[PDB]
Amino acid sequence: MKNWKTSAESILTTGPVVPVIVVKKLEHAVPMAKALVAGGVRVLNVTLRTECAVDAIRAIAKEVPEAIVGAGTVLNPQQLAEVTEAGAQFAISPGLTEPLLKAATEGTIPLIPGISTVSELMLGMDYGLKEFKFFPAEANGGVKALQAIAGPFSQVRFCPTGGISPANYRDYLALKSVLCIGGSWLVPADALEAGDYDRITKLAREAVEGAKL
Amino acid sequence: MKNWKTSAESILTTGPVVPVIVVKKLEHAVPMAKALVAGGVRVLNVTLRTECAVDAIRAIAKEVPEAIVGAGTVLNPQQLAEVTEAGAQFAISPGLTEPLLKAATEGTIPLIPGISTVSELMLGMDYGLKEFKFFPAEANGGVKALQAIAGPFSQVRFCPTGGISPANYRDYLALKSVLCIGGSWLVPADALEAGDYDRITKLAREAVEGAKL
Amino acid sequence: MKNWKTSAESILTTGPVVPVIVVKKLEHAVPMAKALVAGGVRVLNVTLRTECAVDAIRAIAKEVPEAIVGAGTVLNPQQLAEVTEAGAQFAISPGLTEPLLKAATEGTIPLIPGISTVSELMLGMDYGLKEFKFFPAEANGGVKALQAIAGPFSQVRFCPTGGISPANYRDYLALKSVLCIGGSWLVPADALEAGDYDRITKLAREAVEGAKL
C-alpha cells in the first residue's frame, strides 16, 4: 500500500457508513464530529466545498483524537498538499486525474478516488490502487452497474457514494465488492445550522444499526 | 480564460440553444445560417461530420458577419488547427483528450469539450476549463445525472447535448449549472436538403421563445 | 492497422458472437474450444480471470489450430506481453489506459479495448484504433446509449459485451456500428465443470443461427 501511514483498506473497513459533510460554520465542526463519534461513526469526510472546510478538518484533527478525519472533493495536488498539512488522515476525490494520482502516491495519506467507468478504475489501478469511491453511484446505474463494473476485478473494493439513502444503502452493503458507502443524511444542513447534535448522534447510530442482517 | 480572443463563457451565454448542424451541400450553409440568425439564433455549431463542414464554417465566417460560427465534433489538434484557420470562433468536441485540451489551450479560440464522468470534467478542469458540453446528455442519465455530476463543482457550467428535444429541453435550462443546450431539431436534414429556410427561421424562433418562464 | 499480424477488423468480423470464457480447470480448455469450433464459433476469448487462463490460451493456441484464440481482461502491458508469448492472436481489455494502448500499438497482435464514454473512445482513437469492446454494454445504457455514442463517429465499429443474452443480442447486431457481441452463455461454468461439450457445441450453434434475419 505505498508510502502511506495508514492503508486505504483500513479507512474503508472501519465502518459501513462514511458521512459526506458540508460544514458551513467553523464552530460547528468539532461538536459535529463528537456527535458523530458518540453515535458510533468514526470516519469523517469533510468536503472541500466550503470556504472553511480546511479550518474544520484542521480543528477536527486537533480536538477529536478519536475520529478518523479526511477530506473530500479533493481535486488536485495543491488541495491534497493543503489538506494533508491541515491534518487530514485520508482523501477522497469525486473522480481521478494522472496528476492527482501521481501526487497522492507520493504523499503521506491514502486517497480513495471516485470512478465511473472501468477505464477509470484501470487508470487508478495502474498506480497501485485497489480501493475506490464509486460515484455518483445511483446516477452511474447503481447496484447492477457496479456489479458489471466489478465483474473483471475481483480484488478491487468500493465505497459507493452519490444518491445513497436509508432506502437503498443495504442493496449496496450486500455486494462482495462494497466495504462501505458514503451518504449526506447523517449530517443535514439544517441540523448543523441549528447545532442539534442530539439529532446527529442518533441519525448516525441508526445508520450503523440499520446496516446489519 | 487563457490566450482566447473570446471566452467560452460568452459563447455559451449568448442564447439558450445552440443548433447542432450537419450540412451536406456547401450552397446551403450561408442561407441556413441567415435563417437561423433571422430567427434569433446566433451561435452556429457546424459539425465536422461532412465532407465539407470546413468549407461551410469558412463561408459562414466570411458572409454571415452577425453569426458566431464554431465547429463541432472536433477530435484532434489537426482538426482544431484546420477549423481555426477556416475562421471558427469556437470549437466543441464530443469528449476530451490530453492532446486536444493541450492544443486548444495553446490556440486562439475557446473549446467547450464534452464530458460524461466527473473524472472527465476534472481532467479538463486541470487545464483551466470551466465550461463543458455534457454529452450525450440523455443516454448519460440526463437531468438527475448532471445534477449529481455537478454536485461537487459549483463553479462549472454546462451545455447539454445529445437527445434534447422541445419535450425535455426546459428540464435542462432549469438547472443552476446549465447555461444552454444543443439540439438538432432546428436544422432538419430534409429542410436543408430542400432549402426551406422559411421553416428553419421559425423552428429557431420557437426554440428561443419556448425557452422562458 | 499498425504492426499487427492480423487486423482488429478481421477478428471482429469473423462471426457474430465471441464467447467470454472463464476456464477454471486446464484440462477443459482444449475440448471446450473444439466444441465451440465444431459449433461454428471460432473467435475464442479466454479471460485472464483464472489462475491458469494463460496455460489455457497456450494450449488452445497449440492444439486447436482452427480457432482464433485471444485473451480477455488484459489490464496492462505485462499481461499483454505474457499472453502474446502464450500465443494469443488478439487481446481484449475491459477499458483502456495510455500505457496499455501504447504497448499494444507496439506489439504484434490487435487489441480491441473496452470503452464507455466518448472521451474514452477518443483516447483510443488517438492511437489509431477504430474497433472497440463497448462495455459493460447493458449497464452503460445499452442500445440507445451506443447509438448516441456512435453518433459523431461513423467510421468506428463496436463489439458490445456486458449483459448480452439471447433476449437482447439481436437488438445489438441490428446497429450499423456493431460487428459482433460478446456473451458468457455459450460457456456456462457448470458445463465446463462437467465437461459436457455436447451442450457447448449446441449453445454455440444456436447462437450463430439465432443471429440472422
From Swiss-Prot, chains A, B, C:
- NCBIfam families, per this entry? eda, PRK05718.1
The subunit field of the Swiss-Prot or TrEMBL record says: Homotrimer.
What the record says about family reads: Belongs to the KHG/KDPG aldolase family.
On the tree of life, the source organism's domain of life is Bacteria
Q: Does the keyword Lyase apply?
A: yes
- Look up and give the organism this protein is from: Escherichia coli O157:H7
Q: Which residues cross the membrane?
A: none
Per the record, the pathway is: Carbohydrate acid metabolism; 2-dehydro-3-deoxy-D-gluconate degradation; D-glyceraldehyde 3-phosphate and pyruvate from 2-dehydro-3-deoxy-D-gluconate: step 2/2; Carbohydrate metabolism; glyoxylate and dicarboxylate metabolism
Reactions catalysed according to its record: 2-dehydro-3-deoxy-6-phospho-D-gluconate = D-glyceraldehyde 3-phosphate + pyruvate; (4S)-4-hydroxy-2-oxoglutarate = glyoxylate + pyruvate
Q: Where does pyruvate bind?
A: R49, T73, K133
Instruction: Give GO MF terms, alphabetically.
Output: (4S)-4-hydroxy-2-oxoglutarate aldolase activity; (R,S)-4-hydroxy-2-oxoglutarate aldolase activity; 2-dehydro-3-deoxy-phosphogluconate aldolase activity
Where is this protein chiefly located? cytoplasm
Compartments where found: Cytoplasm
Keywords assigned by UniProt?
A: Carbohydrate metabolism, Cytoplasm, Lyase, Schiff base
Q: Where does the entry annotate site (Plays a major role in determining the stereoselectivity)?
A: T161
Question: What are its E.C. numbers?
Answer: 4.1.3.42, 4.1.2.14
Q: What is this protein called?
A: KHG/KDPG aldolase
Q: Which GO terms describe its cellular component?
A: cytoplasm
- Function, in words: Involved in the degradation of glucose via the Entner-Doudoroff pathway. Catalyzes the reversible, stereospecific retro-aldol cleavage of 2-keto-3-deoxy-6-phosphogluconate (KDPG) to pyruvate and D-glyceraldehyde-3-phosphate. In addition to its KDPG aldolase activity, catalyzes the reversible cleavage of 2-keto-4-hydroxyglutarate (KHG) to glyoxylate and pyruvate. The enzyme is stereoselective for the S-enantiomer of KHG. Cleavage of KHG could serve in tricarboxylic acid (TCA) cycle regulation or, when operating in the reverse direction, in the detoxification of glyoxylate.
In its keyword annotation, does this UniProt entry include Lyase? Answer: yes
Q: InterPro entries, from UniProt?
A: Aldlse_KDPG_KHG, Aldolase_TIM, KDPG/KHG_AS_1, KDPG/KHG_AS_2
